[PDB]
Design a protein around this ligand. Sequence first.
Ligand code: HEM
Ligand SMILES: O=C(Nc1cc(C(F)(F)F)ccc1-n1ccnc1)C1CCC1
Length: 464
Amino acid sequence: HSHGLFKKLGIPGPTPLPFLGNILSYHKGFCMFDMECHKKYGKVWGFYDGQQPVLAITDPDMIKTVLVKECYSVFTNRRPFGPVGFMKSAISIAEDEEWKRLRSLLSPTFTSGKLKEMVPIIAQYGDVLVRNLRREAETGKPVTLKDVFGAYSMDVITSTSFGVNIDSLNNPQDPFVENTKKLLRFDFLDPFFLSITVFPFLIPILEVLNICVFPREVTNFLRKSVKRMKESRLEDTQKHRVDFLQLMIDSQNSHKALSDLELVAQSIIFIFAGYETTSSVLSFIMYELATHPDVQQKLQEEIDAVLPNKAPPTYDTVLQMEYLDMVVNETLRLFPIAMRLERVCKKDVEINGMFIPKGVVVMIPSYALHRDPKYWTEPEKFLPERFSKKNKDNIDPYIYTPFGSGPRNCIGMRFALMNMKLALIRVLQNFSFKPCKETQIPLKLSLGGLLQPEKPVVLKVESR
Ligand code: HEM
Ligand SMILES: O=C(Nc1cc(C(F)(F)F)ccc1-n1ccnc1)C1CCC1
């Protein structure tokens, strides 16, 4: 039907099948498809997700025009992904003016001043992490990274978002833990979302039936859980609070006001954005450290230098360690878990000599651009020196976009980096991580819609 747009514009791309587009080319995942397309179609190419035209762009100037320059005018919203319900008020899903209102009311919550006030909290569960990690080391068994880092992320969110201070690895089946553990990422190549892509006309049907991609058990629990602590346990209390909920509650005190429904929407999305992301990235970081022990030692030397004798990490301490920042950044280059930055074109626009039709999804292949031979040397190699002070200025901010760019970039980039580094400091201060017999030395990525290892990463943990 609409599979004639990219031919009439002279834009190359794979030839679309009726009713399906190039969806069948996702048999090797999102990232492998963009890598191959980049090789055989050049700098700009197009494809169809069902009947949805998608234009991929790789020019840094064009990317900056979409993400930064023309963000408010045209490239304001992302691609709608499915039946959302009340979660349509989340900032990552909001569109047009409501997003601008929500971005304004939530930006002060992510101030670096607020992050510093949350450092003692997430450092508390860094200590909790090594205690439970020492148990897994004294057991002498290969440790699964997703489980220890998952529980650390659980502790961080439940404390920094609501204030429920609870250990998670040794205290499962807790009400908050059991439900928030169900807020798992969306595999957009699974049967449901693949069917949704082929039948986008069924999304209105699912919405009126009150069928939502977010599990209703988790959403209704958290809206009630917020309700019990929003007023029934907060107004009858004069203690100080530092969690995200309190900062959003205080926003309601004095655009417009955050609806109590809107507040629950943002609180859930911060959990959904922060739970498996940190865990996946931290797992990826420990993989590169173990397979390259030279950088693990140098990082352990730098950490022990700034913090002698396992000194408590602090906000100003973390910003000082630059080899830690190099390791984090280089992992995010190899594994940008978003895999893709997408914007929806609200009107006919010509940018950088290219005409973009209305309704086309403009996509930035972050995984492909991070491994392009044009801008990177030995792209498959883990070389943290790329982000050294001497060499970290040759990198274009629009070819390396792990947290996105422009006004719609990750609002929790500082929180994520501070949280992940704080774990890396405490964990490395007390343990050394080495490969196992069960460890996959040539780590293979999944073929689904998530940037995750094929088999779970397992490593050997020894106390220093
Ligand atoms: C842990 C590692 C994380 C990574 C790699 C990451 C990456 C990203 C990326 C690539 C985007 C899209 C930006 C673009 O389209 O230009 C994004 C959006 C967003 N992220 Fe994250 N993110 C992370 C963690 C978090 C956390 C922990 C939070 C919550 C505190 C968060 C909140 C958000 C929000 C709210 C948006 C939407 C921004 C908006 O719509 O204006 N992210 N993130
Ligand atoms: O989960 C992901 N993206 C994402 C999606 C949504 C939404 F579409 F459901 F609304 C909301 C928030 C985020 N998110 C995560 C981190 N920062 C923001 C990717 C990371 C691997 C899968």
